[PDB]
Amino acid sequence: GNVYEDTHFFELCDKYGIMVWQDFAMGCGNYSQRDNFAAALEKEAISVVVKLRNHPSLILWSGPNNDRVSRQVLSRVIYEFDPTRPYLPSSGYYKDPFYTENPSQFVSQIGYHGCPNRETLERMFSPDSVNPWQNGVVGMWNDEWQTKANRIYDDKFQGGRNDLMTNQVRIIFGEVPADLDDFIFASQSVQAEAMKFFVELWRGRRPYRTGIIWWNIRDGWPLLSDAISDYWGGKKQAFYYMQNVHHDVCCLINPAANGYMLKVDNNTLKDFEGVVEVKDVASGKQVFKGKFVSKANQMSEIATLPMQKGQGMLVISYRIEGNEYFNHYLYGEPPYKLDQYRKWVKKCGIYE
Amino acid sequence: VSEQSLNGRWTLKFFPQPAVPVMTIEGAEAANGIVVDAVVPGNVEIDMEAAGLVEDPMVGNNIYKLRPYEGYQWYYSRTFAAPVVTEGQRLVLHFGGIDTFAEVYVNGIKVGSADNMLIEHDYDITSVVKEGENRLDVIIRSSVMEAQNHFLGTLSIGNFSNEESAPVRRAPSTYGWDIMPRLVSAGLWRDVTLRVENPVTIVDANWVTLSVNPKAREASESLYLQTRLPFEMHDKVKAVITISRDGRQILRKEALMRKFANLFTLNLSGVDAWWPRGYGEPALYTAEVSLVDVTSGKIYDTKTSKIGFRTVKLELDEVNLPGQPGQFQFIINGEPVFAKGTNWVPLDALHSRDASHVEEAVQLMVEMNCNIVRCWGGNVYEDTHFFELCDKYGIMVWQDFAMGCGNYSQRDNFAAALEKEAISVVVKLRNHPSLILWSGPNNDRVSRQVLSRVIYEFDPTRPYLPSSGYYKDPFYTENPSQFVSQIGYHGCPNRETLERMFSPDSVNPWQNGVVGMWNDEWQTKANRIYDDKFQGGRNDLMTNQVRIIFGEVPADLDDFIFASQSVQAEAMKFFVELWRGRRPYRTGIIWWNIRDGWPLLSDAISDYWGGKKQAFYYMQNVHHDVCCLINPAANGYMLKVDNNTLKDFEGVVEVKDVASGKQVFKGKFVSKANQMSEIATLPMQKGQGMLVISYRIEGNEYFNHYLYGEPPYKLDQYRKWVKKCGIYE
């Protein structure tokens, strides 16, 4: 749905070792099968392929099985002008079996909504519209928050995409906080735990799972979206959660049949040794502590942790080569108590 | 805003085409030709017969006397008052049919060049029209000579379709077939009108039935609406959708036009589904969409059409010959329907008279109780009214693309000309519920690419099929196809037709009284495309069939007409009964054919002038929704009843011999819905004869018969059997 980024974007991806999966500018829906559209698209594909085919970061081109666009026009361009890269004609509880039973090895995670940082709300909303509740009614959004939910045409209605925010907060924390700052932290915490769970769930299911690309790191406009950082650079709570589960060597906990499985995932070509410690936040009881060997380019099971009582949150402290890395795991079933969850994150000392 | 008609009296100037064809007005007026009055819509041959320049081609060998005119040019000309156009309005000159290669001039300015007689042609004459009297000139050149502008591939030469037909977009049967005479003709054979379009106008209103629930009387209908909308009119115009039936409004939905193209879905309640004949009612609903100004209330455009909530699916067989022709069944509204109907040939060799025959011709299928009709690819595409009657009377339409017997060009020029034709015909007809299928060695770009891509993009709701003398012979009785296209049997027309299309001295078929020889006129009415004098061929199909069934050929004319018609009547009746009685494996039967397009000696069951042959009445009695028939069996005969409806029926059937009157069988039967049921195995009768099948359902007496024994039969005895039976005359 986006334009083709210019040369400098690929230069930074080349410099910082970030592989690029490039879609052709095609949106949701089927397109024309006639000569005029094919010729206009062939001219575009040939131009963009010759311009970008020299960047090492670029690794793939991407475009019912009779679509001339994806199965002919775009494929012929790649066949003649870039035979070195593959071409792929591809055209509310986060622990629901809808997510946890995805059969795809390479997943495009849908992402979870999250209210931006308060500074962004006061910058893109009118002073009277900073508070989301119209006339103070908990359940209703004003006309401005509905606009920042992407209402393409000014059709006055109530509900829709904006309900995705309060629904997620209600599933995890029971009720929707009336206070604005209590709502921002709650909605950001839901997005933070949900997105962290997806990355940990796919890293922990290797070698069958081969990749995960989530929606998304940054917004292109001051909006209420499922991105983890806004247009003005405001990193949401999810950004920091994802950062700790994106490490080259990450110790994480996955749900198991009769408890939890402590594991370590290696996204490098080198082996590593370390020591991991698992403790409960509130009680401080050490659940597990021992040495692990993280073999290269694979995930390794460390130990099966016994099931804990009720709700709570665990602390995963692991040291590799004299560097202390940290992670956590929220155990129990929702709804959780927002003040109690805030106490767990505070006592843990990983985030703020 | 308005549609002014340009039909009526035109000026027609015709002349032989020179070596360099005439393309301009100056050359057309400079050419030495004849000027006569012409009627639009019309054919040039009609205008010359009105001028007393050609004899009636429907009589004797007069058809051959039109040969020199295939190399003539035709100059239509008329004046017209320009309609009032305001700023932003567009003036469109509309042709329903130009046959064929013509240059269209308006006030001496060329506005278009036509090269396809089967599709409409619209030209924007807004910038060339003048205030007051305007001039409209159409210069047609020779279609036959146009073929020599192409180099034919090897596979395009030697087929039954004329070589002249291969590189041009015309009806292949106009060049000559076995059922239709050669009559290339020319002219403006459909309406010519002037249309005024507002800046806000409807480009296309595509109605699509997504799903239907006949029991709950529900249906999900989609409207794909494309419009022309100036941006100053965005958010200022609204679409008003209206579904109604018999005056009662079923739904009225309004929506603000924020884009030029939108999809509207309507979940309807209390709406009946469209069913083919026998399987229910052909429920039609009036679907209207209008673009209305939100402030002024001005109606900028309105598109109205009668639609039907119906789903069609082509279930293909995967065991008994998977992939072979005929191994499929139509699934209408989820139910497997059994198709019974006729092939649709040209209604008239002069196709401007087609519209004047549609009503009578469609009524033949209604009396015949056809639930399907295949429009043959050798014919033109029928106009909107034909599909309207098929929508109204519940007759499903199988539409061929205008492709004849033989392989066609694989190059870009023919593909582009055919793609333009297919896109035009699909958008025009895709809203009719009666239309159920499109139809086009497995590497033909035409059938496996061009036509299939059009259906894929512009009509994803209908299937597309790339399909390009004793009647009891195992050739017919051992056909493996579930869906059969029956070949049909020849039958001499009713005597009144012979005396109307033959010369008085040529009414009798025997030349010099010799039984075995046909005169030169009967050979002409056997479709002899070119005047090559020979003896034999297609005409022998008549006397051969009479000889197989009745032994000898009757010398008397009326004895021959009744005999040849009886052979066609029994043969065609046997085919329908044989396929209805072999369900559920057999899934349909489409026979050749219900009506002729020219006074000819053909295998049709009714002639061009409406004369129903004996076969028409025989077929009528075996086309009933519930029909009791007798099929041959291994050790006797099998009395059975076939149900082409969705309802069960009870009745009583009686089987008796004609001559003896002995009751062979009598008992009650239960005809379960949408299937054939065996009633009883009848014992074999002695020698020749004929049985009477009398069955009553719901207080209505229906009748049928079965001719048992082996031929040859005695014509006077067979006439006695039909007379004593009291079913026919």
Side-chain angles (χ1 to χ4, degrees), chain B residues 53-355:
Chain B
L53 295 180
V54 297
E55 289 176 308
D56 195 10
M58 320 203 235
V59 167
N61 299 24
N62 291 343
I63 180 82
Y64 304 131
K65 303 189 179 188
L66 307 173
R67 166 72 154 179
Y69 296 109
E70 303 174 350
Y72 269 53
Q73 296 204 234
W74 316 92
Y75 177 27
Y76 282 84
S77 47
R78 79 156 282 167
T79 61
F80 64 94
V84 63
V85 316
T86 63
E87 228 164 61
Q89 291 195 335
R90 274 308 169 162
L91 185 52
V92 175
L93 172 61
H94 166 77
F95 293 91
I98 307 178
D99 183 5
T100 293
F101 301 95
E103 311 293 317
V104 185
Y105 294 89
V106 169
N107 297 326
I109 304 175
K110 183 187 289 190
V111 300
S113 309
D115 51 358
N116 194 325
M117 80 166 284
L118 317 155
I119 67 177
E120 297 145 316
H121 299 277
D122 296 317
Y123 309 111
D124 197 315
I125 63 164
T126 314
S127 73
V128 306
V129 77
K130 71 166 46 133
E131 172 85 316
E133 202 187 48
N134 292 258
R135 242 160 56 89
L136 164 65
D137 303 279
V138 176
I139 300 142
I140 314 174
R141 45 186 183 274
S142 167
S143 305
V144 164
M145 293 301 299
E146 192 63 48
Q148 299 180 36
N149 285 319
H150 310 266
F151 186 84
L152 302 190
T154 305
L155 280 321
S156 298
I157 307 166
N159 317 311
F160 199 91
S161 84
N162 205 278
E163 279 85 350
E164 303 159 348
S165 164
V168 308
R169 291 317 303 154
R170 303 186 69 253
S173 63
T174 62
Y175 298 89
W177 217 272
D178 54 12
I179 58 134
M180 212 71 20
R182 175 172 179 94
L183 215 180
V184 190
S185 189
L188 320 175
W189 64 288
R190 280 186 181 171
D191 293 311
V192 186
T193 56
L194 272 178
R195 295 174 178 169
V196 180
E197 300 166 357
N198 280 321
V200 180
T201 193
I202 296 181
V203 173
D204 180 71
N206 185 17
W207 292 99
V208 170
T209 297
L210 248 56
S211 68
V212 75
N213 193 298
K215 266 121 207 184
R217 312 194 58 230
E218 298 164 345
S220 303
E221 185 84 12
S222 277
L223 169 63
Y224 294 88
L225 185 75
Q226 302 185 52
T227 60
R228 256 168 44 201
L229 189 65
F231 194 80
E232 63 171 4
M233 291 323 258
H234 278 54
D235 313 326
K236 312 205 194 317
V237 185
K238 67 175 178 182
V240 184
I241 309 173
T242 298
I243 308 290
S244 50
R245 177 176 177 183
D246 299 335
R248 319 153 209 221
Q249 174 202 278
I250 311 279
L251 163 146
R252 192 177 186 276
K253 192 230 195 325
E254 291 196 5
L256 191 63
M257 282 308 265
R258 309 178 148 288
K259 316 174 311 216
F260 79 107
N262 306 251
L263 163 64
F264 303 105
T265 39
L266 315 174
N267 290 352
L268 308 164
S269 282
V271 284
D272 295 314
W274 188 94
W275 293 94
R277 292 191 74 82
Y279 287 91
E281 307 288 326
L284 288 179
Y285 288 75
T286 295
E288 171 171 319
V289 47
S290 305
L291 308 178
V292 187
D293 197 289
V294 162
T295 298
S296 82
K298 174 168 186 171
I299 300 183
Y300 295 107
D301 199 3
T302 292
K303 253 54 185 172
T304 308
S305 59
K306 293 172 220 95
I307 69 171
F309 311 124
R310 157 212 57 74
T311 67
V312 56
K313 197 198 91 103
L314 193 77
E315 208 205 59
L316 310 140
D317 178 282
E318 320 278 62
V319 173
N320 304 58
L321 303 99
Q324 309 325 298
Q327 307 304 102
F328 54 85
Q329 185 173 30
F330 284 107
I331 309 295
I332 308 296
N333 301 330
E335 300 286 341
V337 303
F338 178 80
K340 39 174 182 183
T342 172
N343 283 86
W344 199 256
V345 310
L347 289 174
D348 204 305
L350 303 171
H351 286 273
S352 68
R353 305 197 285 233
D354 282 355

Side-chain angles (χ1 to χ4, degrees), chain B residues 628-658:
Chain B
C628 276
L629 55 101
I630 284 152
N631 277 147
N635 302 323
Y637 328 102
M638 183 99 236
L639 176 75
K640 45 184 76 180
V641 55
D642 189 45
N643 199 322
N644 295 158
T645 77
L646 297 182
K647 302 222 91 203
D648 303 322
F649 293 95
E650 300 186 18
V652 168
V653 52
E654 187 178 8
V655 176
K656 300 185 308 178
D657 179 64
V658 166

